[PDB]
Design a protein around this ligand. Structure first.
Ligand code: SIA
Ligand code: SIA
Lengths: 270, 268, 272, 272, 271
């Protein structure tokens, strides 16, 4: 029904390190050598809810990585503590393109449709894998066209709400569908996550990019994510809209995300 | 309640509430949605079908029973200090392959869940106090006798008539469309709500585990839990699912709560 | 104006006033159908034949509240007045807009939802120590209000009233009588009132509304002085249009919601 | 460059100026029909035949206000100037946009509301101690303004004026005469003026407007110095376009609203 | 660069003022359509995506010479100009209050001409060296050979539809680097501050502000601003305010100029 012991900071030289990385988008065609890279395959639409079987590659998934940190280690131990992150979406300016082979405005005389519609942006930084809760708009969705997707082995009506028997951890890049996995708010004590969704059909994307913003990862007690086994975990998804082909066929478009994470040495009980 | 000193003594309570859009049985199809919306032919024959009406989610939590010294003139109560609350499953709206109407002459995406959004939560030391107010005084709720609605109707209930009140004491039973928070009461509850209307309006939603909502009032006093009960209420409508033929259903999402409480001494 | 002196201290120096105002959208009789809405909107054939029907015009809501009497003697060197310090105010019944089964026009070839109340939003409130002072300004100087002689409008019309003509003023002294479309707060007066307003227009625009019991609006001015209640009267005014209800055949009515107020006042000494 | 010294204190060291400016949308004669609107908008057949009709072009509103005389000996090493410290400004008549019964196009097969005034919004104001300095910049260098010889525009046309050509400048010295479409604030000058503006475009966009008497805008710069009023003149300028009125047959006109100002000034000593 | 103390006293501060005109595609100030692109064209297929010359917006940029600081470049410390703050505005916003140009129009040829509307893209950067760029495109197959004055990579690969760090550049030429395929490199630009926004969609209302009252601080979290290498200050921007829709539905980008007023101070550094 209703429901690590942190000591002092280590000071002096080499008590701080920074980790820098980017994650490329996982919209469905996730192979950097292939023509549709950075987009999904063409979206298809189920005839009925009990025949909802998306094609292989039409499904966005989370991006994720584990980064090795310098090895630190007794009655106490030292852990890396994530203090802050500077993060930005890369390639926003690529959306200033209206000459691609797309549907166009004004009786074939106007601009090509820009990438537009649904936006979904999330990132997470933690000291262990992001903990996931299963929740879907259709419990009957059949993911069997792509056995590389990680989804529950059984299906039940209750998964259109919150059924806590259906959980996971984000342990693989380009494998956990966004549409059915979300952060588990009853866990993730050692991760910070931030997300937004703007829906609708052809909604204008609203995006910003700057190298001047720092996000503090410390909690209300002044403690950041503590990196278990000297691993830092970073996850994200950045859907910026749909590309609309000549005939009306549509694909998700995603952009990469950059991270610069500041960490510090923290002594902990052992 | 005359509030005295803090006891120096803390606890947290964690829970979620599932949405009550109308199909509220977790074992059946369409859980977390309403039944198909229907439309009255006239205002004097406005009788929603059973299960097409969203209602408030709510629960009462039994807190740890505090020692009380009835021989003395003070008592200890739990005081709700703050809450971290989030809508769960927002990413589930990133789905345009469901059996829905679709864009661009049957070649484009399925329509995502879109349209009206309604988001509210409340945390208090007693049931959320409600005021009746409706868009149509004549609405007939008799297709579902489990709904809690007034026993009589009157034209004046399209505005504020203070003779029509209730308390949110049952989950999945009080229609959002005719009950709102009573701003003349709720001295011992904090509530927060928003509505964004229109037909096919983009949902705009956020989720994070980093935001704390302070529940202390202007005197530094949080909700005080009468009889060791903590009351949590919400509703989170994120839009409508548009079926192939244009039939529509409300879609709602669950809400998570993590409430911090402390012991407070009060006059008995 | 009033010469403001020190605050009065002690255990009787504060009071609070709580009230609500029901909306005045046009059908303002609580015993009748369509309460809280206007009558059906009609459209002029030409600007010189612009005569709204009775009850299709929203008006301001207003009340004067009697405060506890101060000053048993009025011949004194100084007097005491109630000073409004702050207000907690909310729009009531926002959740009532979560209703798409009313007898309305509907989406997707008669299969989808009923249209929710949507379109133009207009929200304002005022708290003062005397009636809200008003300036006339209209979109059409020729508008003929004679279908309803209970509306308070100027007795003469002139072209210049489509801009600001300071010869056309009034005070908000009657509930449900001053049309919103032709009367606005007079920004050259209202020294003893605080007012706040917003407008979001367009045809079928989503209403965007909030409600909470946690927000206090401070009424003190830049000198730390709130509205001072002349004759021990507190004046509260508002209007809250949340959109239009679209009937089956396309006919439309304004929809308004009530507003709640909880006002904190304190005793202030003034020169007499 | 004026060298600022100390503030002058004591009685009579502060003054206030209150005024309003009526809108200059194109029909700018308060005695005539359509005051506060433009004439109907016309559309060029080609960029080399872009000759707007007289009265279809919004212009800036502006006034020079004579301040109280600062009488003093002019031969000494200091002088006194009025310094504008802050302004409270509001758009007047926002509630007038709550009107959907005017002779307009209407919604839902001639059954619904008249279209409210909607679309493009442009709001700007400026307070300074000399005229607002202007930069010419246009969307079409060939625009022919000769239908109305009272408009102030450059005497020559050149392709480069579709960007910033610093040889094309002016000063806002006349009300209802400088078109908004081709004159903007010069950001390389205006050291002695503060200006603030916003534009929201699109075709039928909802106007989003606020009004309150509770907001003060500080005019002091980063060094604590406000506009200094040369020759005891205070310059106020604005434009407030709130959208278009859509007539029965689809003909459209700009609609503007007046703006109110309350400006606080103080005496400042300057080097002579 | 090892940053030491501020230089104080008379002449320790200077200001730079400039504007940059927009580079939408027709970038010749003596010709018609200046400040706009040429007419937008649409590829028939992905492998025939070859924009016409002049239809492609590029970044504006300039390097400004600052007062010379070091007569002897072999001293054990040197002085550099440090950019502290910038006041920047988009110029000519009021020019968008124009609905009588030769455009498509509303309401069955009776209403207003369409105003410039749709996609907005706004960015500026101030730094002590050229803005560092990362290549990223919506279509690796885009053929820029209709205009060999555009600076783009000679070899393009599918991986350029995401972030491939092998594809970088520096913004060293005005009116030459297309916005559609070059963005700031977030893994570099340690000595530049950049700010950008994009609002997309088809006919979206432009939402724009202008004022002379806002100062943007360029100091980083350590209190250090961009340090001007070789006494050069680098300013870059792009301000797309939408499209002009011609009578027949043909569309062109419209851009506006941007003004900058930059305050700089003398900073000692190790040499
Ligand atoms: C709100 C309302 O009154 N709905 C009524 C509906 C609608 O008028 C039509 O279905 C059109 O949607 O008709 C019913 O026969 C039905 O379908 O069950 C009765 C129901 O009470
Ligand atoms: C604003 C206005 O002038 N309304 C007038 C209307 C409208 O012109 C039409 O009904 C079209 O809606 O016509 C009336 O005969 C009516 O219906 O009562 C008189 C009324 O004065």
């Amino acid at each position: 029904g209703s429901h690590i012991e942190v000591l002092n900071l280590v000071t002096g030289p080499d008590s701080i390190t920074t980790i820098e990385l980017y994650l490329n988008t996982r919209m469905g065609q996730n192979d950097e050598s292939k023509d549709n890279y950075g987009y999904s395959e063409k979206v298809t639409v189920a005839n009925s809810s009990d025949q909802d079987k998306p094609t292989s590659g039409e499904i966005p998934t989370y991006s994720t990585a584990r980064i090795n940190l310098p090895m630190l280690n007794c009655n106490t131990l030292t852990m890396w503590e994530a203090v802050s992150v500077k993060t930005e979406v890369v390639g926003v300016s690529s959306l200033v393109n209206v000459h691609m082979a797309t549907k166009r405005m004004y009786d074939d005389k106007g601009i090509g449709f820009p990438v537009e519609g649904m936006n979904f942006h999330m990132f997470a930084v933690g000291g262990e894998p992001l903990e996931l809760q299963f929740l879907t708009g259709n419990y009957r969705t059949d993911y069997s066209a792509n056995d590389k997707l990680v989804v529950p082995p059984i299906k039940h009506q209750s998964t259109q709400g919150l059924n806590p028997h259906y959980k996971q951890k984000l342990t693989k890049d380009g494998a956990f569908p966004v549409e059915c996995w979300c952060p588990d708010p009853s866990k993730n004590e050692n991760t910070r996550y931030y997300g937004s969704y703007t829906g609708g059909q052809s909604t204008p994307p609203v995006l910003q990019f700057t190298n001047t913003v720092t996000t503090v990862l410390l909690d209300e007690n002044g403690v950041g994510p503590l990196c278990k086994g000297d691993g830092l975990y970073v996850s994200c998804c950045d859907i910026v809209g749909f590309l609309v082909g000549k005939d009306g066929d549509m694909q998700y478009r995603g952009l990469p995300r950059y991270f610069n994470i500041l960490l510090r040495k923290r002594t902990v009980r052992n």
